[PDB]
Amino acid sequence: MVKEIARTIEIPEGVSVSLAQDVFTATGPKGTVERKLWYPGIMIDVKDGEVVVDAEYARKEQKAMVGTFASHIRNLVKGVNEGFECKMSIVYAHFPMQVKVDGKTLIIGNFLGEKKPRFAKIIGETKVKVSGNDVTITGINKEDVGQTAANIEQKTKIKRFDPRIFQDGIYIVQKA
Amino acid sequence: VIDAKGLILGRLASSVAKQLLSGDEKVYIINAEQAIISGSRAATLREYRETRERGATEFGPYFPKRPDRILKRTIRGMLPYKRARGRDAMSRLKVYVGVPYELKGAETVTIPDADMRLLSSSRYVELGEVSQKMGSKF
Amino acid sequence: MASIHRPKRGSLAFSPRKRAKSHIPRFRAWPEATGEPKLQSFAGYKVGMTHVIMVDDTKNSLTQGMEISVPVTVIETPAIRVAAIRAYAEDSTGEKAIAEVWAADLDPELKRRIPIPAAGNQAEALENIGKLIEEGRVSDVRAVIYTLPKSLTGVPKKVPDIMESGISARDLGTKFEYSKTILGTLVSVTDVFKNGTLVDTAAITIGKGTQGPVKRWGIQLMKGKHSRQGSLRQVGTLGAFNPSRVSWRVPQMGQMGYHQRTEFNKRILKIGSDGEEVTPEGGFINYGLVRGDYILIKGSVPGPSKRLIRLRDPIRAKKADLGEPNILYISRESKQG
Amino acid sequence: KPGSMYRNVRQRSFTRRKYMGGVPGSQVIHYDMGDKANTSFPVKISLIVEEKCQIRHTALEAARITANRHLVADTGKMGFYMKLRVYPHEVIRENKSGMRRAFGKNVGTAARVKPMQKIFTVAVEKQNFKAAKEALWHAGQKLPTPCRIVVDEGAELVQ
Amino acid sequence: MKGMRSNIPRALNAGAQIACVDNTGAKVVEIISVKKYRGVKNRMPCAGIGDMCVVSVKKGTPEMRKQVLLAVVVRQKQEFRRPDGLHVSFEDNAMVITDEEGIPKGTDIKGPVAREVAERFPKIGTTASIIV
Amino acid sequence: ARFPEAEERLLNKKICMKCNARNAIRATRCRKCGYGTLRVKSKE
RNA sequence: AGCUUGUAGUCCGUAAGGGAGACAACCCAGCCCGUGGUUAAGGUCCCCAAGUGUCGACUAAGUGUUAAUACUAAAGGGCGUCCCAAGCCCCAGACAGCUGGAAGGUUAGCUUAGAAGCAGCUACCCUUCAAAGAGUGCGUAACAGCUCACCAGUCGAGGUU
RNA sequence: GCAGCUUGCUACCUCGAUGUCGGUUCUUUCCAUCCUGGCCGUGCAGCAGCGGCCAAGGGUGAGGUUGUUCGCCUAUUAAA
RNA sequence: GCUCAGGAAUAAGAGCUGAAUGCAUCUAAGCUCGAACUCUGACCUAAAAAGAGACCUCUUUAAGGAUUCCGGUAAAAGACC
């Protein structure tokens, strides 16, 4: 049938979305988030608790860009409304990992017996909690939460040995 | 006094060079760091580091580093600068990073056909980015 | 052809190897301010070398705690005068001098270097600099200082040497206040450097005049049969057939020595006031005896005796707080023996 | 001895074997594969070269081997019919001193084919069309020319 | 290896025929190469006190002779400075046969050994009668 | 032991058979070179 | 082979001037002197005289910005992107996701005490059923939970070769 | 297919001379990388290998025979 | 005697978010890491940078420079101190 490129994003109540200049800004009960979403040939309008993203043209690049921008807007509104949570587990064989939070970084001491602790960077206002053997990562930005989890998982990489024997590290069990 | 912000580098250079060769004015260009170079950032950086590190730089080509001096070089490449006419043209041209204090508050102009919003994509970088990735302090 | 490789003869990190344009070393960088205000540099004159017996206090060293003989350079360091305060404005084109205030009263022998600035505007010059700092036209402040070699006797010259020094402070206002406090005063080397600390030494090296590539770059001589075929101390080849030119990287004869050099991490082993503690019997050869206050620098320093040596706080120091050296014996035996 | 040597057609034909001497025999043994007697195969595809080239007998044998192996594996021993239409008629010679009396000695045989000329034809049933097509693509990978497969019969039987 | 307290000039270069001063049956050994030594173009392998060299037994018993062995130089005529500024020199050069680990093949060492080798390889010190 | 949640991230990816790059478990083609055949990372 | 040796035409040789960056022989052109105009080849963003010319599309690779020329890289591949056409499925609801069962067959026969559906050679294995095979997976010394090929409800538009 | 670093083919330049091999000295460049740095796979437990990708900043040595290039051999070496 | 670095931006590569293609996807945009590379950063040189510089002081028949004299931290002549 008729192919429509335009996409619609509902604005939940309590959420104010604005697109002054070429920057999206969503304010919600859980916080405020700001992203840059500018692409020539793509137009974004905000109106009556509903954002519409359309492409002037209809080629595959414009279809992909309207899809990506609509998904980003949806993720921003979901972050400002209900947020995002990511679950990671701590597993080790012989050395008990000492995992803690020292502010905007996560300290991972005794990783595989190392005398120098690993440092994992925290992104944005992302709250990381080490609840014993697991890590919860809550935030208002899916980008920030996913990157914090990725930073943890990559800092806990065993870059030398056979992965089928050495499996120590911190691994995401649930994405944002 | 031309404001180079959001202007295509080569098209601004061509316009200014042809004006200088028409030869009735002194041209000042400000915010040379804010000029635009279309194309992918990786490709532009690759070509510009190649040009910067190319020559027999002890006794060969000496490609500049500051964005204003790079823009001056770009205009120089579009002039008969070995001739008396091109020498006068380059002598009548001054390029600045940002706005110099003496030209502060002066009335500027912009080339409508050099505007960057006529580009069809987002594949571009700024001359200031190129200069600072080549290691210029400005 | 399967070639044997060698590292290049000499360093191209000091090219062109020309004569230094002045007899005074100029500092191109100043380190970070990490405490109370003070000058970041001093200037003395190299006297000579001696050696001390000291207890190895260097942490983690194999010989730590035992007697070790350490060569030291003696540097005679009379008090320098803070002649002026200069303010620098930062813009896109770099730093520019924006203001300078000279001290009201300056030493009469400064006329051997420059016509003496009069006792004119100092209060209003300082208030102008304060206004400039308040309005944001000043990026930083440096102190112009000069040495007073007339008090020395191994240095024949009475004309002072003038140089800019950084001020170490946490903020520009603190820098300006400290510079106003120290302006026109006589600063001692204890007011710049403390004993046991690391410094960087800049100096003009020993001049050797025109030297061949063998001595100048350390190129090999011709060997065996080639040693007596007429090109013994002489480079084998100036270049290939193509490119049709002699590269600037080919070792060649030219000026050797009398360059500016910076040595890093020279430790101060003693800040002394009486030169009789270090002067040997018979005096230092071609210099004489120390009379004023002096400094002992662990190891060697660039420059010959009587050369002006500039000391600055370290810019690439590795080790943390080192301590006070335990000098158990300063050798004053005759250096001429 | 790369196939790029005797690949381009720059010369007249060289085939009259009674005026030459000592041509090595061709490596290609069979020219009809699969089920030779049956002719009621509905689908019938062919491989056509799209350039004017000379194909050596060794290249022909390699393509025949690969196509026959693929067809026998997929369709079975008698699930297909395969015909190699061209025979190596041109005599390839080589100059084995230098360039004096450079007229070469006969080193092999090649088939001089024209653009759009059929090289191999494979007949199969409806359900074996993709297997025949894949095998003939593999065969075309061994030839010194770009090739394309065309459906001769069974176009409506395939789609 | 473990650092020595003294500064040792690498005095013996490859080809030097040194007297062997233990009871292994080797009287004179010629230095072939120096272990753990990387050189530069045209520079002969150099060894000072405390260094381990590959040697060939030129004189001595017929069983020792022509064998490629490891030796440690224990005496050198080239002067070396102790940390406290005193310069030490021996009357001759002298080596002792050892393994890779540093254990001497001989049982007693005639002549004084250097304290530097005596500390770097403790078994040479125990084998030697006096350490200077 | 071998932990399933670690194994999911470490051993549960496809490998390109021409450039050895890791790819998603559902990927039918290599992202680096576009190769159409990918094998699961050999976990034994 | 910018190799060697023929043939037809035309050139350089002996051919200016204009244009291709320069170019013996490539394009215009064969050229007495001076002046004016209009054109050829080629070009019109600047260097450089004249278009930042018009219309309709493509390219994201600085690819390209290279009539001929020996001065311009191939086979193969691409769910990169833009087109044309033909099959099949599709609001009697396609394609992909969200759900719920994979209960009767068999533990099919396998020397050595033991791989009893994944070493293995073979089928109108159920009456009939909107639904369950002589076997698609990290895993089994002989057994299993945990994943499929299948019709079912789901939002609801094209999907696939 | 690439390179033009082997050997051929050719005869366009040089026969009113462009001094012929190898070594030595000194400088520079390429990457198709021997080591050093970062990665991926493994029939990768570790040690250590094997295969591939990026990367030319630094290093790539000392000796016996032979004029040798090349090659053989010796002992070091991260590699020679 | 002295002669580590740190930071930025990247290659291969590993990931996050993410559509085309409801799902998935390191990629098509976007984002984070990531080398002895590159840049910066502690070094040398550099107003002959033709945009041929900034500041201050002294003085305009002066300031100051050179020559002669006694020299050497310098030096082939010059120059330099």
DSSP C138-172: --EEEEEEE--GGG-SSS---S--EEEEEEE-SSH
Beta bridge partners, C52, equal C70, C330
Cis previous bond, C7, omega within 30: no
| Maximum distance among all Cα pairs of chain E, rounded to whole angstroms | 44
Q: Which one-letter amino acid corresponds to residue B72?
A: K
Contacts of B137 (CB under 8 A, 6+ apart): C94
The approach used to solve this structure was cryo-EM
Contact call for C92 and B98, based on CB within 8 A: yes
**Which helix (H) or strand (E) segment is A137 a member of?**
strand A134-139
Cβ contact C151:C186 at 8 Å = no
C118 vs C83: CA distance, rounded Å? 12
Contacts of C183 (CB under 8 A, 6+ apart): C82, C84, C85, C101, C103, C143
| Maximum distance among all Cα pairs of chain A, rounded to whole angstroms | 64
Task: Tell me, yes or no, if B96 comes closer than 8 A to chain C by beta carbon.
Answer: yes
Helix B84-91, helix B9-22: angle, nearest 10: 110
Buried b or exposed e, range C178-188, using 16+ CB within 10 angstroms: bbeebbbeebb
From the number of C-beta atoms within 10 Å of its C-beta (0-12, 13-18, 19+), residue F3 rates as middle
Nearest residue to D45 via CA among D159, D157, D152: D152
E95 vs E72: CA distance, rounded Å? 5
User: What does residue A75 show for φ and ψ, rounded to 5 degrees?
Assistant: -65, -40
CA D146, D150, D152: angle at the middle one, nearest 5?
Answer: 145
From the number of C-beta atoms within 10 Å of its C-beta (0-12, 13-18, 19+), residue F28 rates as exposed
From the number of C-beta atoms within 10 Å of its C-beta (0-12, 13-18, 19+), residue E76 rates as buried
C135 vs E61: CA distance, rounded Å? 92
**Residues within 8 A of C (CB atoms), E 10-69 only:** 40-42
Nearest residue to C260 via CA among C214, C307, C210, C218: C307
Contact call for C248 and B138, based on CB within 8 A: no
- Write down which residues 15-44 in F have CB closer than 7 A to strand I: 19, 21-24, 26-27, 31-32
The answer to whether E38 CB is within 7 Å of strand H is: yes
Contact call for A164 and F44, based on CB within 8 A: yes
F5 vs C242: CA distance, rounded Å? 64
Buried b or exposed e, range C262-298, using 16+ CB within 10 angstroms: bbebbbbbbbbeebeebbbeebbeebbbbbbbbbbbb
Instruction: Retrieve residue C174's tokens.
Output: 């603190």
Cis previous bond, E45, omega within 30: no
> Measured between alpha carbons, how far is residue E101 from residues E72, E98, E130 in Å?
11, 8, 22
Shortest Cα distance, chain A CAs vs residue F40, angstroms = 14
* Cα dihedral sign, E3-E8-E11-E16: negative
D85 vs D119: CA distance, rounded Å? 5
**Residue E26's Cα: distance from chain center in Å?**
14
A84 vs A126: CA distance, rounded Å? 10
Instruction: Retrieve residue C249's tokens.
Output: 């990287």
Contacts of A173 (CB under 8 A, 6+ apart): A87, A88, A89, F5
* Cα dihedral sign, E58-E64-E68-E72: negative
* Nearest CB to C69; choose among E5, E41, E84: E84
Tokens 């050999």 label which residue? Answer: F42
Discontinuities in chain B with C to N beyond 2.5 Å fall right after none
Residue of B nearest to A61 (CA): B121
Cβ neighbours around A95 below 10 Å, total: 13
B62 vs A125: CA distance, rounded Å? 47
Nearest residue to A86 via CA among A170, A1, A7: A170
Shortest Cα distance, chain B CAs vs residue A45, angstroms = 20
Give the CB-side neighbour count of residue C3, counting CA atoms within 13 A.
Answer: 3
The answer to whether A151 CB is within 7 Å of strand I is: yes
Instruction: Retrieve residue B7's tokens.
Output: 């202007």
Q: Which one-letter amino acid corresponds to residue C146?
A: Y
8-state DSSP, E20: B
C198 vs C313: CA distance, rounded Å? 7
The answer to whether C310 CB is within 7 Å of strand I is: no
E75 vs E124: CA distance, rounded Å? 12
Helix B67-76, helix B9-22: angle, nearest 10: 60
E118 vs E127: CA distance, rounded Å? 9
B76 vs C146: CA distance, rounded Å? 46
- Write down which residues 60-79 in A have CB closer than 7 A to strand I: 60-61, 63-68, 71-72, 75
Nucleotide nearest residue E7, measured CA to C1': I1
Q: Strand H: which nucleotides have any atom within 7 A of a protein Cβ? A: 1, 8-10, 22-28, 39-47, 51-53, 58-63, 69-71, 74-80
D111 vs C277: CA distance, rounded Å? 105
Q: Which residues of A are less than 8 Å from B119 in CB distance?
A: 40
C161 vs C152: CA distance, rounded Å? 13
> How many beta-carbon contacts under 8 Å exist across B and C?
7
Tokens 């061994």 label which residue? Answer: D142
* Nearest CB to E85; choose among C62, C69, C220: C69
Tokens 């003070």 label which residue? Answer: C38
Contacts of C230 (CB under 8 A, 6+ apart): none
Cβ neighbours around C245 below 10 Å, total: 12
Nearest residue to C32 via CA among C265, C315, C320: C315
Output the distance from A157 CA to G118 C1' rounded to whole Å.
35
* Cα dihedral sign, E41-E45-E48-E50: positive
Output the distance from F43 CA to G119 C1' rounded to whole Å.
22
Buried b or exposed e, range C83-103, using 16+ CB within 10 angstroms: bbbbbbbeeeeeeeebbebbb
User: What does residue A56 show for φ and ψ, rounded to 5 degrees?
Assistant: -60, -40
**Which helix (H) or strand (E) segment is C44 a member of?**
strand C41-55
Contacts of B112 (CB under 8 A, 6+ apart): none
Output the distance from D1 CA to H69 C1' rounded to whole Å.
30
D56 vs D106: CA distance, rounded Å? 13
Q: Tell me which protein residue sits closest to nucleotide G158, measuring alpha carbon to C1'.
A: A1
Dihedral, A164, A166, A169, A171 alpha carbons, nearest 10: 10
* Nearest CB to B58; choose among C92, C94, C248: C248
Shortest Cα distance, chain E CAs vs residue C68, angstroms = 4
Task: Tell me, yes or no, if A39 comes closer than 8 A to chain B by beta carbon.
Answer: yes
- Write down which residues 16-45 in C have CB closer than 7 A to strand I: 16-23, 25-29
User: What does residue D44 show for φ and ψ, rounded to 5 degrees?
Assistant: -150, 105
Nucleotide nearest residue B123, measured CA to C1': G60
